[PDB]
Amino acid sequence: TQKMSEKDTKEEILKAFKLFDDDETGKISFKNLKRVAKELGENLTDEELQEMIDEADRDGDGEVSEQEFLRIMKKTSLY
Template sequence: MSRKSLYLSAASFKGKTRGKSRGKTPDKRLIEDDYDINDNDISLMKEAFYILDINDAGVINKRDFISVLELMKEDCIIGQRMLQDLSSLEEDITIDIFIRHLQKKRGNKTSKEGIQSVFNLIDNGEGKVTLESLKEMCKEIGESIPDEQIRDALDKLSPDTKCITEDEFMVLMKPNKSR
């Protein structure tokens, strides 16, 4: 038996495979290794998934999910906007599908599509970010910023209209070196 085949058989005996993972089999890799977001965000997304997975089956029940979305329309507009596309999926909503969907919805801050995605989550439905939509966003993420502070920020950013358009938002979100 050659040395190479001896190594490969010993490695496969230990559950190792050749390839990019070098020693980690897919079932032993952490779920965090598969996503391009930080661990804190993933833990928050997992927590949200487990809240929606009422039966602890590892899958979100479509009927329960749709009823939760209906409840969210009143108090959690941004959260409801982030999750609403999941209700139209034909497949079961697993944790992987859930996290990948939220990762896509929250957008990549460096791409135009990602910035547009974020804008669409916080706009007022008319293509503008207003005082009311910013207050709603702060409420949903648990920040208590006084109305005067939000109003002052809007006055500085857009003194004429008191709102931020998508084009202005795109300029604001670009990295500093490109402004």
């Protein structure tokens, strides 16, 4: 069945990544994550910011580059 014919989830994810990455550093850090949390205005308790980064790869990168963010998004590949 046809749904998304476009490729531009990569564009979405890239421009989303840049809305976290203020620093233009190529990483979403904990700080960038919490800076996003206070931009939405959601009163998160630091530990779930830690969970979100810990989820998005302490195995290889440590904090979150675009491939880790792509991995965290592509986790929903019908899931």
